[PDB]
Amino acid sequence: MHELTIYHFMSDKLNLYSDIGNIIALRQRAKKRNIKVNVVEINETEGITFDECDIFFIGGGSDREQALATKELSKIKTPLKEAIEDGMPGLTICGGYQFLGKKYITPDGTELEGLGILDFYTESKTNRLTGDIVIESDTFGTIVGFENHGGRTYHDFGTLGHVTFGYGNNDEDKKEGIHYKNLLGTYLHGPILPKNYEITDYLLEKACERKGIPFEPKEIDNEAEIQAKQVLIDRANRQKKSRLEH
Amino acid sequence: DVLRKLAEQVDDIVFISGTNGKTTTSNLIGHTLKANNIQIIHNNEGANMAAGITSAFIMQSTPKTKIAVIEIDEGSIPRVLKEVTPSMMVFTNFFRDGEIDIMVNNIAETISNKGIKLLLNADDPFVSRLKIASDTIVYYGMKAHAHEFEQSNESRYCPNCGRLLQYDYIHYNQIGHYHCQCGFKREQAKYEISSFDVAPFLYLNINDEKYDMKIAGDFNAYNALAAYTVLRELGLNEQTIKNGFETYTSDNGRMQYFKKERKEAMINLAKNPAGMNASLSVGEQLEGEKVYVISLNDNAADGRDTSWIYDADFEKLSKQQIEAIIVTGTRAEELQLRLKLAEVEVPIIVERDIYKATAKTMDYKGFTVAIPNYTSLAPMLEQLNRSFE
Ligand SMILES: [Mg+2]
Ligand SMILES: [Zn+2]
């Protein structure tokens, strides 16, 4: 049977609600395309290669967990970079996204080192960017979720799209996340994939193309996903009219 | 001076005290008496000190009320017993949360040589210490291995001689079958639970009769037996108690049961993954098919992040006999989608209005399992009360 392997990095954390739902969403959209998903949890990285990897995933944890995860991930920084440069699809969430960069600065000014896969940095404040977020993307259609992060990320790469409601990476850009080759990074909760099937299908379709297996049928039932998105789109719209009428 | 004259007009006055379980014990007694059309005086959990008890006697005394059922804060026992002598007093337990020792001594001095019938938990050594305070003692308790309690661990002192208390068997913590070389020991019980389970409600074996209840919680077995003991000592027989016990239910939306003819429902608050997994596993202990109503609000007190529902085990619903799942609250669609991703293949109905969603369950002959998160609870419980009148 056609199969895709997901490398789930650093799943040893106190909580992984975001992690699990994203994995569920990928498994189920692939199953509808007659593709079985194999999840490999990787917490010891020594001698790990990306030859058996189709998609990787790095979630977020506490600042302690993230610093530990980064020290372990740095033992394979060079294969990961080469994998990404080769087009390896990947999804990274919050701290997993931030620590692909060069540094993460805490509110109290402490500089934490990231992997340096990409040349950017993140600066956190005490006042958080929090609320509903609605993004309009050409690749991922309408992306919807919840953001709640102190970190402001400043990078010069492509993103998941323009933010029509909420903040995204920082206070000013009105752009969310990162999209570099097939590597995705985001601050969105929900977790991001259950409602945002175009993102899920993106990662699976790039993986199928790279492996030489079909991704079919391309168009399936998205009604439940659409109805869940529409609740936040409508609420976001109600919230805008309230400010314009203020 | 008035409480005294009111209390003298009541033949039987039952006081309920101890540190835990007072309200459930009290409510079980009062519910069972009223279900036999006995007129009673009865206070409540917000009125168990001197002032509130006095108010209960003034507000509720009539010429017909011949029993008072009074829960009383353990600290209030001396002040109140300067005015009222109960005919019997049941004590549930004393937990420290050597401070228990002093308080128990003060209670013993207060009730001594007053002719009060004491109903003592034989399994609690600090309750049993009250045997010195009366010549009329009734013991209740639980047989060893009646249940394997969750379990938790220190050495306690014999209230009579100051030795470390030896235990032969521990129910939990200080509660168990203890025996000191001075003679102080877990006494033989007149009313005993030989066995019980919770699946999902309390099912008790008391003196070789089965009591199929409608409340839950392992801790509530002792409260039910404390209530049982009072009622036997008032002269009610096993069948009359069984009738009341079989219909008592909680009123806070935690494992709360409802019934109207052949239609049954229960509601259990769940607002995080552990609570949801527990609520979903209740349905599978329930016989026959089920209908679910599950509510997910995202108001300030709920939190705005609904991601935790992906850590709940909604997949397990595929192992149950379920007619339909109604999803409701402001994030009802998140639940629909979670169930789609869980591959739970049963009719799913989106009805965001919690009152309309809850009423809808009355259209199904299955056992309703109603599961709200925090700000969903009050509207869902209100509708269930309305629907089951
Ligand atoms: Mg138990
Ligand atoms: Zn002793």
Numbering used by the authors:
A (entry chain A): 1 to 246
B (entry chain B): 38 to 134, 140 to 194, 197 to 433
What does the literature reporting this entry say, word for word?
GatD has sequence similarities to the catalytic domains of glutamine amidotransferases, while MurT is similar in sequence to the substrate-binding domains of Mur ligases. Together, these two proteins catalyze the amidation of α-D-isoglutamic acid of cell wall precursor stem peptides in an ATP-dependent reaction.
The native structure of the GatD/MurT complex was solved at a resolution of 2.04 Å using single isomorphous replacement with anomalous scattering (SIRAS). The GatD/MurT heterodimer adopts a boomerang-shaped conformation, with GatD packing against the C-terminal domain of MurT. Extensive interactions between GatD and MurT establish a large, continuous interface that buries a total surface area of 940 Å2 from solvent (calculated with PISA28). Instead, GatD-H189 is shifted towards the heterodimer interface, where it contacts an aspartic acid (D349) of MurT, thus establishing a possible alternative catalytic triad (GatD-C94, GatD-H189, MurT-D349) involving residues from both GatD and MurT. The crystal structure of GatD bound to MurT establishes an initial framework for probing the function of this enzyme complex and for developing strategies to intervene with amidation. These experiments show that, while the conformation of the unliganded GatD/MurT complex is indeed open and elongated as observed in the crystal structure, the complex can breathe somewhat in solution. The almost linear arrangement between the two MurT domains appears to be unique to MurT as all other known conformations of this two-domain segment are more closed in Mur ligases.
